[PDB]
Structures are given as C-alpha cells and as structure tokens.
C-alpha cells in the first residue's frame, strides 16, 4: 500500500535546482494495455507523456533536487483502483547550463519499497532558449504574446563512427515540427559544434526545407516545421568530412520562429524533434509547450442583456510605476474579435489602438495573443444613446486561457 521514490539527478557532477513532477498514470497505462503490449505502452507514455497528462498540473506533486542532486517522493500509493499503480516522472524546470532529463516511467510492484531512480538525459534534446533575443529559463511551459520571436535549440550527438565505409552513414536527418498552428518559421540562426558556427560551411551543401517552402506541404503534413539532411544535399562528401572531425561531439541547431495570429489560447502547443540516420531508426524528443492568453467582454445596456456595438476601448497595462497602452498590428478593419499579428506597448495613450465592440450576443469584444498578468480595459467612448458607467474595468488574463469568464461591462442609457 506504500512506496517511495528517490530521484538522483547527476550530470560525475550532482545537480541542485532541477524540479521534478510525479504523475499517476495507472489508468492511462491500463487503457493502452487493451490495444498494446506492456513494453509498447511503457514507451508510448515515456515518449509523449503530455499526450496522457497535463504536464503543468498543480496537484501533481513536485520536488526540487538538493545539494546532492537528490529528490525524494515519500509515501506513494501501491494500488490505484485495484491496479498496481504506475507512476511517470518529468523534469519541469532545469538550471543552467544543464539539459532536460528523459521522462521516465515505472510500473509496480517490482517487492521494493525504497525505489531509487536515476533520470538520465535524452539523446536528442530541445529547448526554448530566448524570446525576442532575451534569454529565458529552461522550463516545460512558456507563455507567449503574438508577434514574439522565439529562439529554439535542438541538440544531438554526432556518431563516433560517422566517417565509416562498411559509406556507412548516408543520411543524417533532423526533423522538427508542430502538429497545431501558432508559429511560422522565421530562420535557421546557427549550427554550432564545439562552440563554433559551422552554418556557413554547410549552407548550399545540406538539404534544408521548412514550412515556408512550396515543397513542404506536399511532402509533410505539418503547419510548422523544418527538415534538414546533412548527407542529403549537393555535397554530402564534404559535409561528412566536416562532421567526422567532430565525431562524438554534440551539434546544436538554433532556429527562430514567430508567434502568429493563428496561435489561440486554451491550447498548449508543443514541438517534436526527430533525428534519424536511416528510415529504420529514429531518436526523438518533444520540446517545451507554449500557450498564449486572451479575454472576452460583453458590453451591454445596464440591467438588460442588450449588446452595444461601437463602444470604444483601449487596453491598459502597468510596468511598475508606468501606465502602458496596447498597439495592435494586423487589425485594420476588425471589430469585436481582434486577432492581431503583434501587440506592442506605448506610454502615449493617443497612439494606442481603439478597440470597438461588435454587437454580438455572447461576447462582443475578444482579444487574443496576450501575456498573462493584470490589465485594465479603459472605455474611451460609449456608443450614442449611452453614457459610460465605470470608466475602467481591471481584469486578469489567466495563464493560457480565455479567462475564468467573459467580463460583463455595463453602459447607462441617457433617456
């Protein structure tokens, strides 16, 4: 009825600061057991854990590694609804410069009370390193605004025997993609190994494709992505010679992506990097999730539920002492539902974008692409026939959603 898990994060060197989260996936596992083997289930959850769990669940117990790189999870249940429990583990945030461990899983009993796990790192790794050229923390979930330039790094090892004849290696694929929309591929910014950029040597010598290319949609299904084959370009030989002199070393592929107006809230969007040396064998990792914010209002005649169009608003934010006001690009000829390509901020309120209500029934002013935190909707004009009731409506964009509810705002009829 009771078990313990002692996690040991080490990378020779122990690692303090790494936070782990435990997930009970007992019933998620036994669901797959109907269609699948124990091994196929065990791996499926380990591979794509976020498919089976909310990875940022508050209730999922979380602990941080101490000085010794050690993290206890005391007193777990052995059973779970008449099944021997199966628990999954996930490194939620990692300190610099360390990498994110693989998402390991265990099925009970094995019996053993004090169970010591040692979460090793994945053979492919992905991170969100920067947002608008400013470094962020390595964590499983990042909240984003529309028009943000996101910088990703996919890291993987070169085989020790890369220059073998048997040539042995004629393919070094690197495939990144997202299943759901939200990003557009901006650019490949570097390919570094041994802290030295080899992108200039490789350009015009690899195969390289992305979402922006006409050849992508016929060959790949996905809205965002890029494919990169080192040994499948116009000069595979020279590119193999280049890689052999860094045989064993860790290549990092950096690229930028732009958050677009198809990115919607209530939708966490991950990416997946796949590395393959042949069509037979792939090593693969899922990056961190990203989500954006939004909010809905209902402008109405006081007392009734009468929707009032052409009530003008500006969105206000605090920057410590400083008031700032939203400037929405890509919203020429929109009203009610605003789906901007970039929300940027100004201290001059005369320059701020005037948001006008539509007169739709359910909610007649929506904004997407917002960061979470506190805001204030300021009514600059009531529609003709109505005076303003309360000039400011302060609210909170909840992290990754449309909010807990649509915010009703009343106008007073003059007659």
Author numbering: 37 to 47, 66 to 164, 171 to 226, 233 to 481
Provide the authors' own sentences about this structure as they appear in the paper:
So-called major pilins polymerize head-to-tail into the pilus backbone, with ancillary pilins added at the tip (adhesin) and base (anchor).
In the hexagonal crystal structure of GG-SpaD, the N-domain is angled about 100° from the M- and C-domains. Compared to the interface interactions between the closed N- and M-domains, the open N-domain has lost most of these contacts. Because Asp181 has shifted about 5 Å away from Lys45, isopeptide bond formation is no longer possible between these two residues. The crystal packing of the open conformation revealed that the single GG-SpaD molecule in the asymmetric unit lacks a linear pilus-like structure. Since this offers a unique structural perspective to backbone pilins, we suggest that the open conformation represents an intermediary snapshot of the backbone pilin during its sortase-mediated assembly into the SpaFED pilus.
